[PDB]
Write an enzyme that holds these catalytic residues in place. Structure first.
Site, PDB file in Angstrom:
ATOM      1  N   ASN A   1       4.273   0.450   6.217  1.00  0.00           N
ATOM      2  CA  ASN A   1       5.570   1.129   6.259  1.00  0.00           C
ATOM      3  C   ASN A   1       5.597   1.950   7.545  1.00  0.00           C
ATOM      4  O   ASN A   1       5.027   3.043   7.604  1.00  0.00           O
ATOM      5  CB  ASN A   1       5.788   2.003   5.029  1.00  0.00           C
TER       6      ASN A   1
ATOM      7  N   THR B   1      -7.651   2.022   8.439  1.00  0.00           N
ATOM      8  CA  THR B   1      -7.331   2.059   7.018  1.00  0.00           C
ATOM      9  C   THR B   1      -6.748   0.727   6.562  1.00  0.00           C
ATOM     10  O   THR B   1      -7.072   0.235   5.474  1.00  0.00           O
ATOM     11  CB  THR B   1      -6.362   3.207   6.719  1.00  0.00           C
TER      12      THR B   1
ATOM     13  N   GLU C   1      -8.097  -2.052   3.850  1.00  0.00           N
ATOM     14  CA  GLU C   1      -7.238  -2.563   2.789  1.00  0.00           C
ATOM     15  C   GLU C   1      -7.179  -4.088   2.810  1.00  0.00           C
ATOM     16  O   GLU C   1      -7.301  -4.738   1.764  1.00  0.00           O
ATOM     17  CB  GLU C   1      -5.839  -1.962   2.925  1.00  0.00           C
TER      18      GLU C   1
ATOM     19  N   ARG D   1     -11.150   9.429   4.552  1.00  0.00           N
ATOM     20  CA  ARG D   1      -9.744   9.069   4.691  1.00  0.00           C
ATOM     21  C   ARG D   1      -9.579   7.561   4.883  1.00  0.00           C
ATOM     22  O   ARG D   1      -8.776   6.917   4.200  1.00  0.00           O
ATOM     23  CB  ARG D   1      -9.142   9.851   5.860  1.00  0.00           C
TER      24      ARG D   1
ATOM     25  N   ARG E   1      -1.028   9.148  -2.041  1.00  0.00           N
ATOM     26  CA  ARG E   1      -0.429   9.699  -0.837  1.00  0.00           C
ATOM     27  C   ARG E   1      -0.557  11.219  -0.793  1.00  0.00           C
ATOM     28  O   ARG E   1      -0.792  11.763   0.291  1.00  0.00           O
ATOM     29  CB  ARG E   1       1.021   9.243  -0.677  1.00  0.00           C
TER      30      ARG E   1
ATOM     31  N   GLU F   1       4.665   5.982   8.545  1.00  0.00           N
ATOM     32  CA  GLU F   1       3.624   6.267   9.527  1.00  0.00           C
ATOM     33  C   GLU F   1       4.123   7.225  10.602  1.00  0.00           C
ATOM     34  O   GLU F   1       3.410   8.158  10.991  1.00  0.00           O
ATOM     35  CB  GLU F   1       3.131   4.963  10.153  1.00  0.00           C
TER      36      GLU F   1
ATOM     37  N   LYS G   1      -2.069  -1.256  -5.063  1.00  0.00           N
ATOM     38  CA  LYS G   1      -1.052  -2.222  -4.663  1.00  0.00           C
ATOM     39  C   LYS G   1      -1.296  -3.577  -5.321  1.00  0.00           C
ATOM     40  O   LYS G   1      -0.347  -4.272  -5.697  1.00  0.00           O
ATOM     41  CB  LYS G   1      -1.031  -2.351  -3.141  1.00  0.00           C
TER      42      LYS G   1
END
Ligand code: TRP
Ligand code: TRP
Ligand code: MG
Ligand code: MG
Ligand code: MG
Lengths: 265, 265
Positions: free
Chosen positions: A193, A242, A246, A156, A17, A197, A167
């Site tokens: 989350n 993103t 994931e 990014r 992060r 965001e 995770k």
């Protein structure tokens, strides 16, 4: 503390992060530099310039040259670099860096650079340009700024691979259950989350103001990139893509797992 | 409102002021991006890597590759772009832009890029880098950032050609008498305004804080690049070298005027 020669420092959610936050600045800087030039339709017109033996837009051609040259010095051996032309890269002239294993073996196939190129040209360029126009003498300047923006946004977005792998290793029994279920919605719930965001979006607004406004004038106090445009770039494109990266990474993660997921299924 | 297709808008001293100010942001942004990486001595060591048919540092080799590619798309036909390797460029693959005449015929011969490479590597890199040391997996990243910095600094310093030509045309009679009499100090005095130099300097310090401090964290406020380093970069190098370009441009200015100078003779 990210060190790509030390996998444990890369697969650390707090280090990740922090790097993502730092990428906010990079992206905002690049968009501000692209805001110097007009919409430049000629850059994105297919084969406007009949460059011999090439098919595509001028931006694609200039991007292809940089990628080819950067592949010669190992840019795409790095796990945080995803090429826009993966089939047209050449053997590097420098010996390999030899990175430790961080991502699963298939990770290079997770590549959404086509959707990035699409939304960047169709949505972002019209909104960050200083206006509608086409100046032949700024074809190269505008397209180089496009390349800088495209590579920061792609870095990014494809950083989601590191988020997904970290995770996964923090909670293998949950993610093994989700992957064997193909619970796409469950996977999305596990990584999302909304409160975090929203706070990203609000920090982007202030970064656009602080970086985009000359701090010598307080009489023409407008930002050279609209802050809400930056916030919308993340909300509509960067954050959703993103998560797609994931999710797609995790859906194949058992391809690179020991068949001791018979324990957790 | 500079239009390089319109010479009258380029040799406008007010338009030149705004463009130089806009270049402050571009330089500060680039140094901020360079501050992410270590001093990277391997980048600047002559003939360190096994690179065929080349003599120099890795940075010089990478910069040469870029300049050769960009010369294929007419980057150095532009009068505001000065190459670091002027004798090693390639013929453009696109027909020329056809710029109108703005600067004197000999303008491409005034080139201080050698000096720029020297003070950037010797004096700026050690002061903006996040720390001392080599990091092999960031040789490419650090060299690319250097290249962005070097090109922005070179463009700002060689912009002194437009400054000198605009001043020369605002008050011809003054300057020829000086150029005729080989008075570099008199020419230096006519182009130097110390008060504006201190004003761009104070603005730079504020810009370094506004662009280099994450605005969500604006107690321990630590700028990514020291404000005093950005000020001293202009004071000790950029401003003096811009004036050097100006004087060397004006000292040769009579080569491009009809000999009715005899009036002022
Ligand atoms: N602005 C000019 C010169 C230039 C600057 N940077 C460039 C990069 C590539 C090509 C050209 C350029 C152009 O677009 O032609
Ligand atoms: N950081 C890696 C990968 C990389 C990122 N950007 C680059 C630009 C050029 C070359 C390599 C890179 C390296 O320097 O090797
Ligand atoms: Mg950048
Ligand atoms: Mg025009
Ligand atoms: Mg830049």
């Amino acid at each position: 503390s990210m060190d790509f020669m030390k996998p444990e420092t890369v697969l650390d959610l707090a280090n990740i992060r922090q790097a993502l936050v730092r990428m906010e600045d990079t992206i905002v800087f690049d968009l501000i530099e692209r805001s110097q030039f007009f919409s430049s339709p000629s850059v994105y017109e297919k084969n406007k310039y009949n460059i011999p033996n090439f098919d595509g837009t001028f931006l694609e051609w200039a991007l292809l040259q940089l990628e080819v040259a950067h592949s010669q010095i190992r840019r795409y051996e790095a796990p945080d670099e995803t090429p826009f032309f993966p089939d047209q890269l050449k053997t590097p002239i420098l010996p390999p860096i030899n990175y430790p294993k961080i991502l699963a073996k298939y990770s290079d196939e997770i590549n959404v650079n086509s959707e990035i190129m699409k939304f960047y040209v169709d949505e972002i360029v019209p909104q960050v340009s200083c206006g509608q126009g086409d100046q032949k003498e700024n074809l190269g300047s505008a397209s180089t700024c496009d390349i800088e923006c495209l590579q920061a946004i792609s870095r990014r977005i494809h950083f989601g691979k590191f988020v997904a792998e970290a995770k996964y290793q923090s909670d293998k029994p949950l993610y093994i259950k989700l992957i064997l279920d193909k619970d796409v919605k469950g996977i999305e719930n596990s990584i999302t989350n909304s409160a975090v965001e929203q706070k990203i979006l609000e920090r982007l607004i202030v970064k656009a103001e602080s970086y985009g406004v000359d701090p010598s004038l307080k009489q023409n106090v407008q930002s050279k990139v609209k802050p809400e445009v930056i916030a919308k770039l993340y909300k509509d494109w960067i954050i959703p893509l993103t998560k797609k990266v994931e999710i797609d990474y995790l859906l194949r993660r058992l391809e690179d797992e020991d068949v001791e997921l018979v324990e957790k299924y």
